[PDB]
Ligand binder design. Structure first.
Ligand SMILES: Nc1ncnc2c1ncn2[C@@H]1O[C@H](COP(=O)(O)OP(=O)(O)O)[C@@H](O)[C@H]1O
Ligand code: ALF
Length: 795
């Protein structure tokens, strides 16, 4: 797949060493190369060139620290390569550098290539590799930037990374789940790769923690700053622009709050102290950010502005807040949102230069807080908050919320300025808030569901999940991991013996949560891709329905209208999405009339459309579809069948099942007991159900359990995609004991055999995956899927 660079053989030779040495000497007479070197010599890392190379050359593992923008990411790789080339051994270099995000790997590779007077990829010295996109460099004497997900995928093809000579783990402070896994895998690999060199780099790092973890490996600090960046706290921001607004650590904040205000009145005007007193800790003040942006463009010198917001809802709100003003309507401004859910083509536009009279304003999430360098950025506005997932071990409920930024994230955000020229960073938290921020975010492995952790451990054949936990830098609790094992068994991704099923193999290859991965996989298998990807896109992110202040009743009636007779919150989103695409074909004014009439968010709908393309790419790289288009005819033969779609929904949401009792309707969920239906759902006032079963995705606990989104489902969908099957008594079938319904006992025998055929189908798909040819009709794989579909259609 994406392992072309990996599965090459590292074959150094002296003749290619001489060609690289001569080419390097020829570069030193090229004007463009010479001018780039003038810029490189200004970086603090350039002064450490001999010291950095000598340490990497004498030690297997090296921890490199340095100030933001000191040059690690773009220079250290070049220092290793150019040192080898100058020593006459350049062909022995196969340097791989990991980046946490795709926008980092692309832009850094393009920048390094330009610093070497070369294009990126094209068999030159530098290139990049990401999911389904690559610019690959030459075989020997080369640098490859990639994502950590790429390296994890490589470990499935070569657990030893045999052809790589240097692996550079960058931004290691970003303790994301995959990075911690990769870091532990690299540590185990050292003894099996005595020839491999490992470099660990971060600008904001407890470097002794990583040194100690890697056997007290040597540390080296790159001293110096590139350009000064002035910092401002909330009181300083309010003082400068004269702005007037139109768990235990919080107890400390409240205790020190009155004394802090007193000490503040001695250093700031009373107006600003009163404003600090009434500022809101719950959400980011978008009006203040807009007012600060107005002040910068009207009173400060030229330079792009970069704004950090928690999520997409804040970005679009601020964007509309600016665009509603006459000043920002003109072509003197180019306002660019930046979100990880945007297509990579859209993310790269942030790096395009602006005309001299044009001010660039980038509104980004934490996607932009590390690695990347934006040329004209001079002003950084730090909203002070960051989206974080959190996990509670009392119920299967994980929450994503906007938390206070840590000091490391703040330093990384400040570091986006001061790279090519001086800059200013504005932090929207007061000084008392600053003293109570944490140094780093809690590692993601300690606060998220761990289903992907267990799938990753199993697909990489790393051994027992207990032994691997003991090797992690920060191991999660056993109960959290055991809870993930149980969830993966209920999804039938693991069998009773904690071993990957055929389905579990494909789910581990899909870079999404297995509930979503199982849904889009069977949407591709059952040829109903487009409606399922729309449902999957809305289960991730959010649904596109909004409720203005009112008068929720008229918005309710619109939602039930879009549901038709489906009794499905998820088919409602599909109908709302399909009507939106058709409204767009009519015209822009009529598209707005559609969104206003049905209380739909065009911004959310466009975001959902982007995510559908990303899901199809995942299925394309996994071999289950033939193109990146979610509406490919080859994947949508059954896209108009509500029963088949609802089965795929059930395939994804099981075991989140609810039972309906009548006479007056009551709902039960085995784990929570009696639940209720969220008033936003279309099934709140429903008393007529064709079936007594619902599937759901989101649960909200407010002293009462509400199912946010649910669809009625036939017991035969639960029978096939459920758990254990038992026949009771006096002729009933049971699914996981509690799901009981009267049915001929031989149906249970049929489902056991069809499940087995489905496993055989997925097993044959493991080696070389190709999409099911739904035009063959007379094929084994199509006959199996048709038999399952026939069972779903009729009892
Ligand atoms: N696309 C670019 N345009 C202009 N200058 C750049 C670009 N990319 C990097 N630089 C310069 O090269 C330096 C290298 O940055 P980087 O290697 O990312 O440093 P670090 O990894 O320490 O943050 C930056 O400080 C910046 O000044
Ligand atoms: F150290 Al950086 F972007 F990686 F400032």
């Amino acid at each position: 797949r994406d392992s072309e660079y990996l599965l090459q053989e590292n074959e150094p030779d002296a003749t290619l060493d001489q060609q690289l040495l001569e080419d390097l000497q020829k570069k030193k007479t090229d004007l463009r190369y010479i001018e780039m070197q003038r810029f490189r010599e200004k970086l603090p890392s350039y002064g450490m060139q001999k010291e950095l190379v000598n340490m990497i050359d004498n030690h297997q593992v090296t921890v490199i620290s340095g100030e933001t923008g000191c040059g690690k990411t773009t220079q250290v790789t070049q220092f290793i390569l150019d040192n080898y080339i100058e020593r006459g051994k350049g062909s022995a270099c196969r340097i791989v550098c990991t980046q946490p995000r795709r926008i980092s790997a692309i832009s850094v590779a393009e920048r390094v290539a330009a610093e070497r007077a070369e294009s990126c990829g094209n068999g030159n010295s530098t290139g990049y590799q990401i999911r389904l996109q690559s610019r690959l460099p030459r075989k020997q004497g080369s640098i490859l930037y990639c994502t950590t997900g790429i390296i994890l995928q490589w470990l499935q093809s070569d657990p030893h990374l045999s052809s790589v000579s240097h692996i550079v783990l960058d931004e290691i402070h970003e303790r994301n789940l995959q990075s911690d896994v990769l870091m532990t895998v690299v540590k185990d690999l050292l003894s099996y790769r005595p020839d491999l060199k490992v470099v660990l780099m971060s600008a904001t790092l407890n470097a002794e923690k990583f040194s100690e973890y890697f056997g007290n490996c040597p540390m080296i600090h790159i001293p110096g700053f590139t350009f000064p960046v002035v910092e401002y706290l909330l009181e300083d921001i309010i003082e400068k622009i004269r702005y007037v607004p139109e768990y235990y650590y919080e107890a400390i904040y409240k205790e020190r709050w009155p004394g802090y205000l007193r000490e503040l009145r001695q250093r700031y005007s009373a107006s600003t102290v009163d404003v600090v007193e009434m500022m809101d800790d719950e959400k980011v003040d978008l009006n203040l950010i807009a007012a600060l942006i107005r002040y910068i463009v009207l009173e400060e010198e030229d330079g792009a502005i970069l704004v950090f917001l928690p999520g997409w809802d804040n970005i679009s709100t601020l964007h509309d807040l600016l665009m509603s003003q006459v000043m920002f309507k003109s072509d003197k401004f180019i306002i660019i949102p930046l979100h990880s859910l945007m297509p990579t083509v859209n993310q790269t536009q942030v790096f395009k230069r602006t005309p001299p009279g044009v001010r660039k304003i980038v509104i980004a999430t934490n996607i932009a807080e590390t690695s990347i360098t934006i040329d004209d950025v001079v002003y950084v506005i730090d909203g002070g908050k960051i989206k974080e997932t959190h996990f509670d071990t009392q119920n299967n409920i994980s929450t994503m919320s906007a938390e206070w930024v840590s000091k490391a994230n703040a330093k990384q955000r400040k570091g986006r300025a001061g790279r090519v020229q001086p800059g200013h960073c504005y932090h929207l938290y007061n000084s008392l808030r600053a003293s109570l921020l944490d140094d780093y975010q809690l590692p993601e492995i300690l606060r998220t569901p761990l289903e992907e952790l267990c799938l990753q451990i199993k697909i990489l054949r790393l051994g027992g999940i207990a032994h691997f936990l003991s090797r992690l830098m920060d191991p999660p609790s056993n109960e959290a991991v055991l809870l993930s094992i149980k969830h993966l068994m209920e999804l039938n991704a693991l069998d009773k013996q904690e071993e990957l099923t055929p389905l579990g193999v494909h789910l581990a290859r899909l870079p999404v949560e297995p509930h979503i991965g199982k849904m889009i996989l069977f949407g591709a298998l059952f040829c109903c891709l487009d409606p399922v990807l729309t449902i999957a896109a809305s289960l991730s992110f959010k649904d596109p329905f909004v409720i203005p202040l009112g008068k929720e009743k008229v918005a309710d009636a619109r939602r039930k209208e879009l549901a038709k007779d489906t009794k499905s919150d998820h088919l409602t989103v599909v109908n709302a999405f399909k009507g939106w695409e058709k409204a767009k074909q009519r015209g822009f004014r009529y598209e707005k009339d559609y969104c206003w009439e049905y209380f739909l968010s065009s911004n959310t709908l466009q975001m959902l459309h982007n995510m559908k393309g990303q899901f199809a790419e995942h299925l394309l790289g996994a071999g289950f579809v033939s193109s990146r288009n979610p509406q490919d005819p080859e994947s949508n033969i059954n896209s108009d069948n509500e029963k088949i779609i609802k089965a795929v929904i059930c395939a994804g949401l099981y075991p989140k099942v609810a039972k309906i009792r009548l006479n007056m309707v009551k709902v039960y969920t085995k784990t929570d007991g009696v639940v209720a239906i969220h008033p936003k759902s279309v099934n709140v006032e429903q008393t007529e159900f064709n079936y007594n079963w619902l599937i759901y995705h989101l649960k909200m606990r407010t002293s009462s359990i509400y199912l946010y989104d649910c669809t009625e489902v036939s017991p035969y969908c639960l029978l096939f995609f459920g758990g254990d099957i038992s026949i009771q008594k006096q002729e009933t079938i049971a699914v996981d004991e509690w799901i009981i319904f009267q049915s001929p006992a031989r149906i249970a025998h049929l489902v056991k055999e069809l499940r087995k055929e489905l496993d055989i189908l997925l097993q044959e798909k493991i080696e070389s995956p190709h999409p099911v040819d739904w035009k063959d009709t007379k094929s084994r794989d199509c006959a199996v899927l048709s038999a399952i579909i026939d069972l779903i259609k009729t009892q």
